[PDB]
Amino acid sequence: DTLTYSNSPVPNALLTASESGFLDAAGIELDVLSGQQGTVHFTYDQPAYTRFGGEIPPLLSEGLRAPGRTRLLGITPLLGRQGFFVRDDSPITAAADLAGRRIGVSASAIRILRGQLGDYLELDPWRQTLVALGSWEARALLHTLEHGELGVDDVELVPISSPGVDVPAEQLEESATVKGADLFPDVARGQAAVLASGDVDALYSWLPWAGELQATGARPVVDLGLDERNAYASVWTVSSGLVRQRPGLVQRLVDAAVDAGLWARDHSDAVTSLHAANLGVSTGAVGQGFGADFQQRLVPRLDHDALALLERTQQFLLTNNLLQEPVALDQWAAPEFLNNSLNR
Numbered sequence: 637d638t639l640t641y642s643n644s645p646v647p648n649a650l651l652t653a654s655e656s657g658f659l660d661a662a663g664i665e666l667d668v669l670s671g672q673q674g675t676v677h678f679t680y681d682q683p684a685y686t687r688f689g690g691e692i693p694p695l696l697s698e699g700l701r702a703p704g705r706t707r708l709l710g711i712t713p714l715l716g717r718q719g720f721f722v723r724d725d726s727p728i729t730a731a732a733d734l735a736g737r738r739i740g741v742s743a744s745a746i747r748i749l750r751g752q753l754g755d756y757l758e759l760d761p762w763r764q765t766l767v768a769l770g771s772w773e774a775r776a777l778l779h780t781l782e783h784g785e786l787g788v789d790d791v792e793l794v795p796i797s798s799p800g801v802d803v804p805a806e807q808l809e810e811s812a813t814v815k816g817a818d819l820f821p822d823v824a825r826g827q828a829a830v831l832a833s834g835d836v837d838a839l840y841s842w843l844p845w846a847g848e849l850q851a852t853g854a855r856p857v858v859d860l861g862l863d864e865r866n867a868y869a870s871v872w873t874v875s876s877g878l879v880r881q882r883p884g885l886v887q888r889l890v891d892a893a894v895d896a897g898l899w900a901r902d903h904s905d906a907v908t909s910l911h912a913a914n915l916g917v918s919t920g921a922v923g924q925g926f927g928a929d930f931q932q933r934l935v936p937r938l939d940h941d942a943l944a945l946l947e948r949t950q951q952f953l954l955t956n957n958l959l960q961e962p963v964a965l966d967q968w969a970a971p972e973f974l975n976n977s978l979n980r
């Protein structure tokens with residue numbers, strides 16, 4: 637069987653099972669989304685599509701635009717090097733030092749931080765979701781400033797380009813695929829340039845990108861990766877029709893991901909390498925961006941703790957008016973598959 641797919645620049649068992657051959661053994665082959673069909677990464681508008689990535693796009697799709705297109709198969713928390721980075725030679729060493737400083741943030745993050753979404757509700761799915769992706773920077777800045785007893789009104793918000801948030805339709809359509817290596821090439825190099833421009837004092841970085849940025853001679857004012865309140869819940873979705881019509885296929889898919897997740901625990905280097913190749917980053921940055929032992933946490937989850945993390949992100953979206961009505965996670969989830977896999 638053939639399924640179209642994609643994954644965000646996050647640790648996940650779908651990519652792992654695919655690259656390690658577990659899916660092939662299960663008689664499943666995945667075809668990654670081309671840049672020309674890239675919007676599906678945000679819209680889920682395909683009959684046999686599966687994605688494992690950030691939770692914001694699917695939450696918006698299910699809760700704001702097209703309820704019912706997907707079912708949730710599992711969750712894999714994400715937490716690693718994260719925060720507002722400054723050059724090593726910057727006199728800024730504590731959160732309090734950010735007072736009155738120039739914080740580079742995406743236009744999307746500025747809308748959220750200002751509490752002024754503008755035309756948000758009128759935007760097409762792609763641009764609309766990109767506004768919501770400004771949430772990473774927004775929450776990170778709020779948490780960071782709390783450390784110095786500061787608020788958003790105590791700093792200068794300066795518009796800059798942020799990876800994954802600023803993705804023009806032309807860039808997407810011109811990209812070979814939605815793999816990080818194609819869509820997000822040399823992120824750290826670009827962020828290092830912003831910090832060297834003399835017009836910004838700090839900017840937000842995370843994922844392996846933060847690992848490579850750090851290597852250029854930069855550091856986070858506050859490493860948000862050290863506090864779980866900065867974690868996100870990567871979600872694994874599949875077209876709802878497959879769940880209802882081809883449960884056998886979905887079960888084989890989930891079984892393969894679980895086996896791949898178990899296998900990953902004893903093949904850390906291979907898992908690091910396949911993620912590094914997929915994202916187009918150094919192998920060392922993967923561990924920094926996802927956590928040193930992320931390979932031990934690849935078996936998908938649907939336990940209450942995992943669902944609570946997903947709910948936490950959903951609440952940030954609701955509070956900030958990015959979502960008006962919440963997605964019923966228990967209804968969205970299709971726990972029977974993962975449950976059957978773990979009971980083998």
Ligand SMILES: O=S(O)c1ccccc1-c1ccccc1
Nearest residue numbers: 644645689690691692693800803
């Ligand atoms: O949750 S998202 O998939 C996501 C999560 C983390 C980093 C990048 C992206 C992304 C943004 C735009 C297009 C493709 C990926």
